[PDB]
Amino acid sequence: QYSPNTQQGRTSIVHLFEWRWVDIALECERYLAPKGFGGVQVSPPNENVAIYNPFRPWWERYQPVSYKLCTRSGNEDEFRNMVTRCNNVGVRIYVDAVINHMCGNAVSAGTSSTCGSYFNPGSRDFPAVPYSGWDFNDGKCKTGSGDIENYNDATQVRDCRLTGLLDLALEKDYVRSKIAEYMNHLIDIGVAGFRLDASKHMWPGDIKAILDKLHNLNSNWFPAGSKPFIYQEVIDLGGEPIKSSDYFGNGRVTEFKYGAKLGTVIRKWNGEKMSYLKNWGEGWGFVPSDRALVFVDNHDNQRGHGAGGASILTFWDARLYKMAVGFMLAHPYGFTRVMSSYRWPRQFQNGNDVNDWVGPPNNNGVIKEVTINPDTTCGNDWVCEHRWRQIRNMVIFRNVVDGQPFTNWYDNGSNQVAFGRGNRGFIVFNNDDWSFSLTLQTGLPAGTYCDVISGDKINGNCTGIKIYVSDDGKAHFSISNSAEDPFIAIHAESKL
Ligand SMILES: [Ca+2]
Ligand SMILES: [Cl-]
């Protein structure tokens, strides 16, 4: 469960948040495969509540009506088509599996659902699965409200409703089997693995019992005996009875400390400095690298209400965001996920974005296609961070240096730092308020290297900055503190 099952030499996945299946299929072929992306985390493919107040929020997809693969992203035919086309170009699909719960207990009964399935939250009736009152934790939860009130009680965090979401009884073999049925449907279609949504709210043993029922991966694309990649979403910043490590038997865990701390460092908040990053990784008390799924932001905390708070860097913060993402992609710790977002009318009041609910770009609820601009960015308010040159080229950096050790660290004691990956890559950051001009040991073979942050290597040329590595491995780096992108990256495949 710990291996991503990506093609050899592909080291990242991208979250194409709220994208339609037909757009993801195209994206695999026209971009992700040639640019060396390992795979795609897709939004939940299963039927969800259609929530009209507010109007079609992104979070409606985290309230299941059934396991039909029928959503605003597409139907089962389109989903199957996407997984096939993506796998055929060597780009994997990971499903966001929402298995802890069905919808909100207060949602009105009816057919307001993305496939038109009937459901009745009040009577605990989801006939399209089918689930009934026997399949939920109503009796088991011991809190007064029936909802999670106290994170110091590990039992209620598992057995009670998260913000009132009907909590499935995952101890029951019937419920475990219905979930496995859904997941095996997806595996046989060809998905490579799963994000297990709200894993903190499930018992590690119930998750295991579900995973125990799963098929090996589709043998047309994956070697026999291949198991689905599992990454469990657990937000653990410490100090609670439930720890990320409790889930290690099932797969990897989301390390939410990673982006919280990195955001604080790059913002230079709370006295933190980039020079402190020298021991980044387990030295900062994160989970073991081989159990970590890392990221700068995710779909929830890029809206500022997550863990931790306002320190999270997002596309809105583009200059510092590119630096943080670049540091993450260069550093060997963890398996990396790149966010890809849509724009929404962010409106702050009282420290809160009142529009943080807004769903994907849409015409009266129909999600807009991803359009590609001549410069290869996206239109229709899709941000497409994964197509930003500075991010995409660092995705490739990480492929190029795969396996190479963290080495040749430099820091100035404040915010100017640099490091290499073996003899395959080197990266330099200036986050201080003065210029960085210094000669550093890059660990690289002598030659002329294209800086892949400012430009690209094309046809024996660089379109950006050129770095000159002498025969002793040393190169001069000049970075103004006022630079558009105050970091430089070079690697074996950017050499002329
Ligand atoms: Ca639960
Ligand atoms: Cl996540």
Domain check: are 115 and 230 in the same one?
Answer: yes
Neighbours of 315 (CB within 10 A): 21
Q: Which residues pair with 457 in a beta bridge?
A: 462
Domain check: are 422 and 281 in the same one?
Answer: no
Judge whether 337 is annotated as a binding position. yes
Whether the Cβ atoms of residue 406 and residue 454 lie closer than 8 Å to each other: no
Domain check: are 420 and 295 in the same one?
Answer: no
Resolution (A): 1.4
What gap in Å lies between CA 118 and CA 110, rounded to an integer? 5
Judge whether 423 is annotated as a binding position. no
Neighbours of 164 (CB within 10 A): 18
**Long-range own/partner contacts, residues 116-125 (CB < 8 A, 24 or more apart):** 117/47, 117/65, 117/66, 117/68, 119/49, 119/65, 119/66, 121/166, 124/166
197 is catalytic: yes
Tell me the angle at which helices 173-189 and 204-211 cross, rounded to the nearest 10 degrees.
50
Domain check: are 229 and 275 in the same one?
Answer: yes
**Long-range own/partner contacts, residues 375-383 (CB < 8 A, 24 or more apart):** 381/342, 381/343, 381/344, 382/19, 382/340, 382/341, 382/342, 382/343, 383/315, 383/340, 383/341, 383/342, 383/343
Boundary-marking domain end, from 359, 385, 403:
403
Q: From the CA of 136, which ligand is nearest?
A: 1
User: Domain containing 386: what range?
Assistant: 2-403
Domain check: are 383 and 453 in the same one?
Answer: no
Boundary-marking domain end, from 383, 403, 423:
403
78 is catalytic: no
Which uninterrupted H or E stretch holds 97?
Answer: strand 92-97
Among residues 64, 307, 46, the alpha carbon closest in space to that of 165 is found at 64
- DSSP H stretches of helix in 151-203: 154-159, 173-189
Among residues 336, 461, 483, the alpha carbon closest in space to that of 401 is found at 336
CATH of the domain at 58: 3.20.20.80
Domain check: are 328 and 442 in the same one?
Answer: no
Domain check: are 11 and 105 in the same one?
Answer: yes
Give the technique used to solve this structure. Answer: X-ray
Domain check: are 456 and 438 in the same one?
Answer: yes
Judge whether 201 is annotated as a binding position. yes
Domain check: are 159 and 284 in the same one?
Answer: yes
Please pick, among 197, 255, 272, 297, the residue that the annotation labels catalytic: 197
What gap in Å lies between CA 155 and CA 463, rounded to an integer? 57
Domain check: are 282 and 372 in the same one?
Answer: yes
Boundary-marking domain end, from 379, 403, 427:
403
Domain check: are 309 and 385 in the same one?
Answer: yes
Domain check: are 451 and 366 in the same one?
Answer: no
CATH of the domain at 414: 2.60.40.1180
Ligand 1 center from residue 210 Cα (angstroms): 14
Ligand 2 center from residue 21 Cα (angstroms): 20
Listed in sequence order, the residues at least 6 apart from 484 whose beta carbon sits closer than 8 Å to its beta carbon are 319
Judge whether 195 is annotated as a binding position. yes
Number of separate domains in the chain = 2
